[PDB]
Amino acid sequence: KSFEVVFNDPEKVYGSGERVAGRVIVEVSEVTRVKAVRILASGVAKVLWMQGSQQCKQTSEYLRYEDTLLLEMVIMRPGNKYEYKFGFELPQGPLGTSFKGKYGSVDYWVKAFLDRPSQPTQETKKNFEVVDLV
Ligand SMILES: [Ca+2]
């Protein structure tokens, strides 16, 4: 019914070593037996190019955090905000912006997972920027 990520600062951009924290906010219309809510956070640097007829792709993992949040099976009900809290630290040193500069893309985000027994996990995704503290 409603499944957002929301960071403590809605307008913040983060640098190296800083801690991204926020909430996961859920709303059900019907009554729901949720298995669990989770989170994957990723800092990936892609760069893609041609090479004759080849397409090459070269990746870099700067960030990769997985958490199961809390508030071990839950009865969600309508008219409440089931809020789940999460937080981690981006690495020290480079965070991607300037992988090999310009043409090298950085890609930061938080995904929220919702699991229910018999039910295909739902997702929701929110981007966030980082600045190189470099
Ligand atoms: Ca946990």
Curated annotation (Swiss-Prot):
Induction of expression: Down-regulated in response to oxidative stress.
GO BP term, pick one: protein import into nucleus
Key word Ubl conjugation present: yes
Post-translational modification (record): Ubiquitinated; undergoes heterotypic 'Lys-48'-/'Lys-63'-branched polyubiquitination catalyzed by ITCH and UBR5 resulting in proteasomal degradation. Deubiquitinated by USP5, leading to TXNIP stabilization.
Domain of life: Eukaryota
GO molecular function, one term: enzyme inhibitor activity
Cell compartment(s), UniProt: Cytoplasm; Nucleus
Any one annotated GO CC term: cytoplasm
Keywords, in A-Z order: Cell cycle, Cytoplasm, Disulfide bond, Isopeptide bond, Nucleus, Phosphoprotein, Transcription, Transcription regulation, Tumor suppressor, Ubl conjugation
Subunit structure: Homodimer; disulfide-linked. Interacts with TXN/thioredoxin through its redox-active site. Interacts with transcriptional repressors ZBTB16, ZBTB32 and HDAC1. Interacts with DDIT4.
Chain's role: May act as an oxidative stress mediator by inhibiting thioredoxin activity or by limiting its bioavailability. Interacts with COPS5 and restores COPS5-induced suppression of CDKN1B stability, blocking the COPS5-mediated translocation of CDKN1B from the nucleus to the cytoplasm. Functions as a transcriptional repressor, possibly by acting as a bridge molecule between transcription factors and corepressor complexes, and over-expression will induce G0/G1 cell cycle arrest. Required for the maturation of natural killer cells. Acts as a suppressor of tumor cell growth.
Family to which the UniProt record says this protein belongs: Belongs to the arrestin family.
Protein's recorded name: Thioredoxin-interacting protein
Lineage of the organism: Eukaryota, Metazoa, Chordata, Craniata, Vertebrata
Residues of the whole record sequence present: 8 to 149 of 391
